Amino acid sequence: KGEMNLNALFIGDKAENGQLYKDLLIDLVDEHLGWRQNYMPQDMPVISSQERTSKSYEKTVNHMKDVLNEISSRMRTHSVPWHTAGRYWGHMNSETLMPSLLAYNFAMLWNGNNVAYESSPATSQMEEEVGHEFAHLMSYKNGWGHIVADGSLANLEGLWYARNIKSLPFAMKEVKPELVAGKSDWELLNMPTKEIMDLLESAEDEIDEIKAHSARSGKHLQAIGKWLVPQTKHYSWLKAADIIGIGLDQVIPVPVDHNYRMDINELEKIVRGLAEEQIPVLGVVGVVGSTEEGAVDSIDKIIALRDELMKDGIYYYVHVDAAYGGYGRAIFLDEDNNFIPYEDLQDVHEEYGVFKEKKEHISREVYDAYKAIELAESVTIDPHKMGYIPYSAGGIVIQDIRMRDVISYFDIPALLGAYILEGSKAGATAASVWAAHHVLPLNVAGYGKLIGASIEGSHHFYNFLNDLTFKVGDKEIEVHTLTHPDFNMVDYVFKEKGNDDLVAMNKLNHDVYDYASYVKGNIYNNEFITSHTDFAIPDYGNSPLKFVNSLGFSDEEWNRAGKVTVLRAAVMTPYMNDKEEFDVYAPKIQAALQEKLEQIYD
Amino acid sequence: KGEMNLNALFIGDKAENGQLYKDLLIDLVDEHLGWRQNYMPQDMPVISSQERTSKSYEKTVNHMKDVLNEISSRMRTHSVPWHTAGRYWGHMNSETLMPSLLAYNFAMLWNGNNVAYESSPATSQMEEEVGHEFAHLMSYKNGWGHIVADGSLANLEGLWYARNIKSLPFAMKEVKPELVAGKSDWELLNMPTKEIMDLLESAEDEIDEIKAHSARSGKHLQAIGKWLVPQTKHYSWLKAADIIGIGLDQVIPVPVDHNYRMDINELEKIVRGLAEEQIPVLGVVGVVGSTEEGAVDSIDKIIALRDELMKDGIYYYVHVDAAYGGYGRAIFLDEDNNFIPYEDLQDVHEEYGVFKEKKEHISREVYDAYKAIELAESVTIDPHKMGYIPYSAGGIVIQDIRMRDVISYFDIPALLGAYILEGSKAGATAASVWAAHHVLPLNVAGYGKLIGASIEGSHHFYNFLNDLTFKVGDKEIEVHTLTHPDFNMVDYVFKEKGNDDLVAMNKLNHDVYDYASYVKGNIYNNEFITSHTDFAIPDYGNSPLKFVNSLGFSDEEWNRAGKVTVLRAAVMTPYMNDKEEFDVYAPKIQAALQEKLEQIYD
Ligand SMILES: CN[C@H](C)Cc1ccc(O)cc1
Ligand SMILES: CN[C@H](C)Cc1ccc(O)cc1
């Protein structure tokens, strides 16, 4: 369709499209009301005219207005103003896509339940297509997916898959050992996911019994091996281990580098070491877009290592924690769904308006990481993160649709609840996601353009912060960026030129955070808002040491402070990719930071 | 406030309040838009006037309209017309509360994330109050709760609690054995939940280490005992066992009676037997409002048995699966939150309009079951079932707020995600639930009146079906109700007077189901819609045998057919409590069933 205008797909930083939203919103409500009325048009309304003007009705409507006025007062006092175009530089939140908002309220009037096709065929059919759209977003050939309440639960479902997968070889030896005849025991704990899947689908009349002897029964949960995750992982991963049965003790942190990506050398050291101890690797977790720094694990290097390890008989499951960055992969896909060759990226992105100044914006490392996702077994992807779809809407994609038989209980599921971890599920959530995917195709013609704006906006912010120097009363405060962003997240810290006190810097940034958040003051009057996170040795190691030293801090300070406090901005506003529009908000960020620093002294 | 009018709280069976909904809906949107604009009123709109009338904008808005028109076409073709006043007699679906609908779309414009207070203080504060409102709904003295994506996941969180609770005594023996000095091993596996909780909160500096040696680590998951559930349980319970680590093999079905409630005799036989084998009881699941029959387990009898078993040193955790019936408990609570004495119920219910003909509507058995919930450790309750709150919104209540320390990771949580099973969570869901609880108090002055209408509507349907006899061309088809409803669910079957063929009846009811569902025809033209379920010996035993014989079927037929097919109606319409309004739809149900039977022959 040539090239769509992202500015028509948001209510707006200043409600510029408020009328458009209301008109479409009310049109949709009207179509629903009309649908209600003409189901059984012969039925007369149960609520009479006299009822609707009676006093009982009025006092109830007034009580309802009272409640909504209190809800409105509370929302309008404390909610976060991240709809702003260039003043909110923090958490993974901006506006959400108007078509999703519209479709959600529309779908909610029907209130269909997607756990069961009978309850809502249309939103049920819609969720199946969303699953296939997740798969093609991941270049899965014959893959699948479904909407999940959120990323954490999708991650848990990742472990549910992996845990059950590693247990299936042992369970084949117990029910139909012919499938795994002549296989060692350690060979069974290192079968590639596909061999396990080909074997299970081979034993049609025995699938039920093999699954009955699987990790579903409760047996062999420590036998199935260690779960490896980046040391900077999201706590949902701990929670996932805990809940799924392998437990916290079967979770091994793989160290990260100075770019805060899984050190593939130490990943190799850990996997090979465990293999010498005959300890199986349940799976490895690669994060494409880490929570605290927006880093992209080299997924290619992770899957190539699995390829170089299978010669030594070592196979690990790979699940990609793309809760945040999953939708980003649409920037690499052309309208035929082919991964754009890297050398053609800057051209295609210019052709499609994905990026508006033609330079390199995406590493080939980050590029390569995203392509390799198609080889992982499963992916967590949050529509309510970089899908710009409203909470609550997470996702999971599986490389092979058959894999869902490892988890099923008893093509379009008649009871999708039998193929997923959770239960009841809003068909409105599926309509909300389907609407976004069908207004914005999951490639450069749609989401690519929105992801590109995110990244470009993050890049202008990186170049603004670099060199940002403020003069705060004899003191000169200087801004330093953490690493060049692998995605759209820009971490940064403020430091006094001279102060070699790292706990004093951490207290400086903890003070700018306080003045740039709900802590100090009214959020509705905050001229600049950000988030903050702590890099502590227990979880980050000395991964920040190169950075702490770049700033002039000693290895002793680093150990004395034991952590570094950094401000993060997951730059999700779509309005800042235009240099000129960013230039409007640059002086308003420096000015807001100037009094926030001046306030931290005096 | 005297007595509120349920008819103002729904868009309506025929959109009678459509205008009211749109006006409030648009008022709310306008307040949000105004809030956006006056965050930083000095900022000029980023989207220019020229942009909003440009051609790029128009084609994108048109593409968006195209997508919504396809969403609308699909929704209006296949969605279920359960908004109708008295024609939908099936699944747990009617209208949802307008204030919830309104609050949800309002909250969604802010799109706050409740996993973290910073992301949305107002909806975060709202969810805390919802938790306390869940607790007081359960008469928990100093209890707690939170919204859960759905019932299944709340059930899973129930097992997460129980699994971790039974493991804590063993873990105290490993980290601070003083707490459990002189305690046998089997005594440790039978400590009452409160003793475990008092001991954990006693060891302040060791809480972290005890939890590190708990079931969170992965150890002792088969040591902690068997999970007992009604044989007619929801598959989420199987799924819960599977996922949580104890596995399918640690799940013991307790037989049910002819009223399809947990046979407390056989519950006692199972628990005492396991105790003679020194096998601990992880917990028992009591269902208040079963999925397929709306039966209410005698929770009082379950907790009194626990009281009579602790003398023999046998303690079991009790979790109440009230996904469906949980909100029903509001019918028993007066405006000071005291459980209404049973002998005063029919008076108070008449006083408050909870019931409109003054007779017994609620057994003292069902009454007693509901009161006993206050002694259970935790409860699953679905706002999106009998809360009339839109999907997706489940719930969990815990008897003792401290219990959440058994599950926490690292008063108003600053990171509610550290106190719950799931992760990201729509603040809009909390606003939606808070709005309902604050328009309708969780007692006879609010939800009681809505639950009462449900039950009364179900009672008129029971008396209609009883005696419903149709003449279908020389054949005379007769309707038989399954059991008197413990709540608002009415099961029933159609039988040929004469046919002693039970598989032939099951095929008759499977044919009425086909004509009364999306199977045969357009759902939008179906004059009567219902659900259907199969009572199969593997899961129901001979619990339906008394019923199968009441209808004239042999114990041989029952074993020959191996199941009975029953139609279920979870009567959730609020419009049918008025005998006169039910009388309008009685002839339209018989007439719709008359041609649906006539169509099944010929
Ligand atoms: C069969 N009843 C299940 C347990 C929950 C559910 C499913 C579909 C619905 O439309 C409504 C409720
Ligand atoms: C810290 N980021 C977590 C992992 C997810 C999240 C939390 C709050 C938000 O407002 C948005 C996203």
Q: A588 by DSSP, 3-state: which? A: helix
A92 CB near ligand 2 (under 6 Å): yes
Q: Do A427 and B17 touch (CB under 8 A)?
A: no
Cβ B327 vs Cβ B386: under 8 Å: yes
Counting ligand 2 atoms within 8 A of each CB, the residue from B110, B111, B117, B119 with the most, and so the one to mutate, is B119
Name the residue among A34, A77, A153 with its Cβ closest to that of B423: A153
| Number of inter-chain CB pairs under 8 A, A vs B | 479
Residue B491: which of B499, B501, B480, B477 has the closest Cα? B480
| CA-wise closest residue to B531 among B77, B78, B80 | B80
**Nearest chain A Cα to B37, which residue?**
A14
What is the rounded distance in angstroms from the CA atom of residue A582 to the CA atom of residue A276? 54
Cα B548 → chain centroid: 28
Q: Is the dihedral of CA A568, A574, A578, A582 positive or negative?
A: negative
CA distance B294 to B568: 9
Q: Which atom of ligand 1 is nearest to the CA of B236?
A: 4
- Say whether B248 and A517 touch across the interface (CB within 8 A): no
B238's CB contacts (< 8 A; 6+ apart) are A409, B248, B251
Q: Quick check: B319 and B162 in contact, CB under 8 A?
A: yes
Two tokens, residue A561: 């402070």
B147 has which bridge partners?
B395
Beta bridge partners of residue A304, listed in sequence order = none
B385 CA closest ligand 1 atom index: 12
Give the ligand 1 atom nearest the CA of B92.
11
- Is the distance from the beta carbon of residue B120 to the nearest atom of ligand 2 less than 6 Å? no
- CA B380, CA A297: separation in Å to the nearest integer? 39
Cα distances (angstroms) measured from residue B514 to each of A118, B492, B509, B529, B532: 12, 15, 8, 10, 9
Distance between CA atoms of residues B257 and B298, nearest Å:
11
Q: Which chain B residues are within 8 Å of A26, Cβ to Cβ?
A: 22, 25-26
> Hey, which of B113, B127, B415 would you mutate to test ligand 2's pocket, going by the most ligand atoms within 8 Å of its Cβ?
B113
Domain segments of chain B as ranges: 132-439, 454-600
Of B37, B77, B121, the CB nearest to A518: B121
Contacts 24+ apart (CB under 8 A), B178-182: B179/B203
Question: Is the omega angle on the peptide bond into residue B392 within 30 degrees of 0, that is, cis?
Answer: yes
Strand A251-254 versus strand A226-230 pairing type: parallel
DSSP-assigned letters across all residues of B163-178: HHHHHHHHHHHHH-GG
β-bridge partners, A113:
A426
CB atoms A218 and B221 under 8 Å: yes
Residue B224: how many CB atoms within 10 A of its CB?
25
Tell me the best of B78, B92, B568 to mutate to test the pocket of ligand 1, counting ligand atoms within 8 Å of each CB and taking the most: B92
CB-CB neighbors (< 8 A) of A151 in chain B: 423-424
CB atoms within 10 A of CB B578: 16
Helices of type H across A440-477: 447-465
Q: Which residues line ligand 1 (CB under 6 A)?
A: A 113, 115-116, 119, 424; B 91-93, 234, 291
Tell me which amino acid residue B77 is.
T
Tell me which amino acid residue A460 is.
H
Of B14, B93, B222, which is closest to A119 when you measure between CB atoms?
B93
The rounded distance, in Å, linking the Cα atoms of B32 and B102 is 12
Residue type at B302 in one-letter notation: I
| Cβ-nearest to A245 among B32, B245, B426 | B245
**Cα distance between residue A213 and residue B249, in whole Å:** 9
What's CA B249's distance to the chain center, in Å? Answer: 26
User: Which overall architecture, per CATH, does domain B454-600 show?
Assistant: Alpha-Beta Complex (3.90)
**Cα dihedral B45, B51, B57, B61 sign:** positive
Which chain B residue has the Cα nearest residue A419? B239
Please report residues of B whose CB lies closer than 8 A to that of A93: 111, 113, 119
Q: Alpha-carbon distance B278 to B223, whole Å?
A: 10
The ligand with the least distance to the CA atom of B115 is 2
CB < 8 Å to A219, chain B: 247, 249
Ligand 2 atom closest to the Cα of residue B120 is 10
- Amino acid identity of B360? E
Q: Provide the shortest C-alpha distance from residue A264 to chain B (in Å).
A: 26
Q: Rounded to a whole number, what is the largest CA-CA distance in chain B?
A: 83
- Name beta bridge partners: B530: B89
Give distance in angstroms: CA of B88 to centre of ligand 1.
14
Which atom of ligand 1 is found nearest the CA of B531? 1
Residues in chain B within 8 Å Cβ distance of A414? none
Q: What is the C-alpha radius of gyration for chain A, rounded to an integer number of angstroms?
A: 26
Choose the residue to mutate in B110, B114, B115 for probing ligand 2, maximizing ligand atoms within 8 Å of C-beta.
Answer: B115
Q: Which fold has domain B132-439?
A: Aspartate Aminotransferase; domain 2 (3.40.640)
Cα(B425) to ligand 2 centroid in Å equals 10
E strand or H helix at B450, and its extent?
Answer: helix B447-465
SS3 per residue for A491-528: EEEEEECCCCCHHHHHHHHHHHHHHCCCCCCCHHHCCC
What is the C-alpha separation between B437 and A64, in angstroms, rounded?
Answer: 11
Q: B437 contacts in A (CB within 8 Å)?
A: none
**Rounded-to-integer distance, Cα B381 and Cα B394, Å:** 6
CA distances from B258 to B20, B111, B523, B548 (A): 46, 48, 34, 11
- Which string of DSSP letters, residue by residue, matches B357-410? S-S--S-HHHHHHHHHGGGSSEEEE-TTTTT-PPSS-EEEEESSGGGGGGT---
Question: Would you say B534 and B565 are in contact if contact means Cβ atoms under 8 Å apart?
Answer: yes
Written as six digits, the tokens of B516 are: 């009364």
Burial label for B223, CB within 10 Å (0-12, 13-18, 19+), is middle
Supply φ then ψ for residue B17, to 5 degrees: -105, 25
User: How many CA atoms, within 13 angstroms, populate the side-chain half-sphere of residue A365?
Assistant: 14
**Using CA atoms, how far apart are residues B33 and B38, in angstroms rounded to an integer?**
9
CA distance B484 to B550: 14
Decide: B151 and B385 in contact? Cβ < 8 Å: yes
Q: In what order do the strands lie in the sheet with B317-322?
A: B144-148, B394-398, B378-381, B317-322, B281-287, B226-230, B251-254
Question: B534: Cβ–Cβ under 8 A, 6 or more apart, which residues?
Answer: B506, B563, B564, B565, B566
Q: CA-CA distance, A285 to B97, in Å (whole number)?
A: 42
Q: What is the SS3 assignment for B281?
A: strand
Whether ligand 2 lies within 6 angstroms of the CB of A91 is answered as yes
Q: What is the spatial distance between Cα B71 and Cα B64, in angstroms, rounded to a whole number?
A: 11
Residue in B18, B31, B61 with CA at minimum distance from that of residue A21: B61
Tokens of B519: 């199977």
Task: Decide if A40 and B87 are in contact by the 8 Å CB cutoff.
Answer: yes
* Reported structure resolution in angstroms: 2.5
The closest of B183, B203, B215 to B283, measured between CA atoms, is B215
Residue A398 tokens read as 């599986």
Q: Report CA(A116)–ligand 1 centroid distance (Å).
A: 7
Q: Which of A239, A218, A258, A214 is nearest to A546 (CA)?
A: A258
Rounded Cα distance, A121 and A415, in Å: 11
Among all bound ligands, the one having the nearest atom to the CA of A570 is 2
Instruction: Using most ligand atoms within 8 A of CB, pick from A110, A114, A115 the residue to mutate for ligand 1.
Output: A115
Does the beta-carbon distance from B13 to A431 stay under 8 Å? no
Method: X-ray
CA B463 vs CA A521, B364, B453, B480, B483: distances in Å: 62, 21, 15, 10, 12
Q: How many angstroms separate the CA atoms of A90 and A567, rounded?
A: 8
Give the span between the Cα atoms of A599 and B15, in whole angstroms. Answer: 55
Pairwise CB contact (< 8 Å): A5 & B67: no
CA of residue B112 to ligand 2 center, whole Å = 10
User: Given an 8 Å threshold on Cβ–Cβ distance, is A4 in contact with B63?
Assistant: yes
Rg of chain B taking only CA atoms, in angstroms: 26
* Beta carbon of B62 within 6 Å of any ligand 2 atom: no
Please tell me the distance from the alpha carbon of residue B248 to that of residue A214, in angstroms, as a whole number.
10
DSSP state of A383: T
Ligand whose nearest atom lies closest to the CA of B568: 1
CB A577 within 8 A of CB A86: no
Question: Could you tell me if B122 and A77 are in contact, meaning their C-beta atoms sit under 8 angstroms apart?
Answer: yes
Pick from A83, A115, A249: CB nearest B217: A249
- Say which residues have a Cβ less than 8 Å from residue B114's Cβ, sequence separation at least 6: B120, B123, B124, B127, B147, B416, B425, B426, B427, B429, B430
Bridge partners for A533 per DSSP: A566
- The verdict on the CB of residue A93 being under 6 Å from ligand 2 is yes
Ligand 1 atom at shortest distance from the alpha carbon of B533? 1
B115 lines ligand 2 (CB under 6 A): yes
Give the DSSP H/E element, type plus range, for residue A22. Answer: helix A18-38
CB contact under 8 A, A13 and B36: yes
Backbone CA torsion sign across B307, B309, B313, B318: negative
Rounded Cα distance between B529 and B11, Å, is: 21
Query: The tokens of A248 are what?
Result: 């916290």
The CA A428 to ligand 1 mean position distance, Å, reads 15
Interchain proximity B72–A17, CB inside 8 Å: no
Query: A279: part of which helix (H) or strand (E)?
Result: none
Nearest by CB to A105, which of B20, B105, B423?
Answer: B105
Which long-range contacts (C-beta less than 8 Å, at least 24 apart) are formed by B535-539?
B535/B292, B535/B563, B535/B564, B535/B565, B535/B566, B536/B562, B536/B563, B537/B562, B537/B563, B539/B231, B539/B232, B539/B253
What is the identity of the amino acid at A530? T
